Amino acid sequence: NVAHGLAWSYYIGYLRLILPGLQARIRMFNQLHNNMLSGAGSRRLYILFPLDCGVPDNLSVVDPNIRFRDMLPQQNIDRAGIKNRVYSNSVYEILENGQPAGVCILEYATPLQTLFAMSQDAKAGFSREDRLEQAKLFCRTLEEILEDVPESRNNCRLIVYQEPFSLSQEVLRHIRQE
Amino acid sequence: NVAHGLAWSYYIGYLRLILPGLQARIRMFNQLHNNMLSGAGSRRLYILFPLDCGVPDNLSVVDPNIRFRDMLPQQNIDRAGIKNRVYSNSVYEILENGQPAGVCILEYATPLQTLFAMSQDAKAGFSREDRLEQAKLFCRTLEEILEDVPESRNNCRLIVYQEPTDGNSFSLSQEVLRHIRQ
Numbered sequence: 523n524v525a526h527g528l529a530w531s532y533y534i535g536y537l538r539l540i541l542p543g544l545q546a547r548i549r550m551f552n553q554l555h556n557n558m559l560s561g562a563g564s565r566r567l568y569i570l571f572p573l574d575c576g577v578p579d580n581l582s583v584v585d586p587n588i589r590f591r592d593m594l595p596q597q598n599i600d601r602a603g604i605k606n607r608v609y610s611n612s613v614y615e616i617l618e619n620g621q622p623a624g625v626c627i628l629e630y631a632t633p634l635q636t637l638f639a640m641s642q643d644a645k646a647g648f649s650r651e652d653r654l655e656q657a658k659l660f661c662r663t664l665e666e667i668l669e670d671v672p673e674s675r676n677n678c679r680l681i682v683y684q685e686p687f688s689l690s691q692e693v694l695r696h697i698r699q700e
Numbered sequence: 701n702v703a704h705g706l707a708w709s710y711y712i713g714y715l716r717l718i719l720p721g722l723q724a725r726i727r728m729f730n731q732l733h734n735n736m737l738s739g740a741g742s743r744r745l746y747i748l749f750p751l752d753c754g755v756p757d758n759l760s761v762v763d764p765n766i767r768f769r770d771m772l773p774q775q776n777i778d779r780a781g782i783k784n785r786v787y788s789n790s791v792y793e794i795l796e797n798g799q800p801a802g803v804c805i806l807e808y809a810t811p812l813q814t815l816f817a818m819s820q821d822a823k824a825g826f827s828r829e830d831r832l833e834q835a836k837l838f839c840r841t842l843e844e845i846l847e848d849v850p851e852s853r854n855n856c857r858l859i860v861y862q863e864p865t866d867g868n869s870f871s872l873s874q875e876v877l878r879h880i881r882q
């Protein structure tokens with residue numbers, strides 16, 4: 523199942539690596555940028571999961587209420603022969619009525635671009651309904667791996683959504699949760 | 701289709717991205733390192749494909765004759781929200797009883813690590829015969845995807861091999877040299 527591969531790829535090749543040392547890179551960010559990620563809703567990685575598989579590379583474009591602030595300190599790992607493979611995250615202010623109402627670390631789940639792609643292939647196949655079906659399983663499979671590792675919930679939130687819808691707002695919702 | 705998602709991932713999420721900008725970075729690497737990557741066989745990205753899916757992080761350990769030299773310039777891309785996501789590649793000397801035999805860009809196919817642990821997982825399951833079958837399919841799917849990308853053959857070389865369990869001899873560093881020597 524493609525989705526299980528995508529989900530295991532995301533965990534193994536990324537989360538499992540990135541998640542143990544997030545709070546470390548955040549204590550550093552606060553010392554460096556004047557205690558910006560102070561709040562509890564600020565000390566997690568918010569991962570956007572459009573079930574439509576539509577994933578823009580620039581967030582400010584898509585919702586002008588999401589403004590780039592800085593990047594977390596870089597994290598450098600030897601990976602499968604690549605020396606110092608770089609793992610980098612970005613920090614964002616979210617706006618409400620043009621005011622900075624909250625800050626967080628934010629990105630999309632990259633492999634949904636891959637799912638989209640497979641789906642448009644003239645021989646691979648899928649349809650919108652098959653692709654949406656695989657997107658949900660991707661998400662479901664990712665959740666259930668994350669359970670066996672309670673370093674997840676402290677460190678990361680999944681934000682899942684389908685568009686049959688305010689992005690900067692739904693992000694504030696979760697930030698304000700904590 | 702697990703291997704299929706993985707073959708599409710390595711391309712859509714990597715080779716699509718970095719193969720085009722590869723030669724610009726090499727020529728820069730040459731100007732900062734005394735024209736090291738001189739040969740046509742050196743100006744390629746060599747990707748190791750162990751069908752055994754045992755993919756260690758450090759090469760020199762797995763074959764003493766593969767020595768880390770330096771790194772290519774990094775390429776930064778805004779990607780799915782991450783600003784300046786970094787794409788980095790490493791350069792290697794390949795030794796032959798202490799004599800520098802060839803020099804290239806070299807790495808493993810990272811997703812092989814994913815099949816490995818997937819197989820080991822208690823519930824995700826599948827055996828060593830099933831993982832081997834999926835690793836093969838990965839390569840095959842990858843290679844057919846790449847047909848529509850004529851730049852690729854001038855930029856990267858897939859090096860597929862299974863390691864011996866029968867006692868036979870296999871030299872990885874030799875294998876890389878053969879490919880370079882093409």
Ligand SMILES: Nc1ncnc2c1ncn2[C@@H]1O[C@@H]2COP(=O)(O)O[C@H]3[C@@H](O)[C@H](n4cnc5c(N)ncnc54)O[C@@H]3COP(=O)(O)O[C@H]2[C@H]1O
Binds near residue numbers: 609631636714814
């Ligand atoms: N440094 C990072 N920063 C932020 N997110 C990250 C990340 N590394 C990984 N991810 C997430 O991990 C997914 C799979 O990572 P993976 O490393 O196993 O497997 C990767 C890897 O095999 C190859 N690859 C991708 N990016 C690479 C890179 N920057 N350097 C070397 N190889 C890379 O592409 C495969 C799939 O790439 P893909 O990007 O689509 O998808 C990545 C991405 O979704």
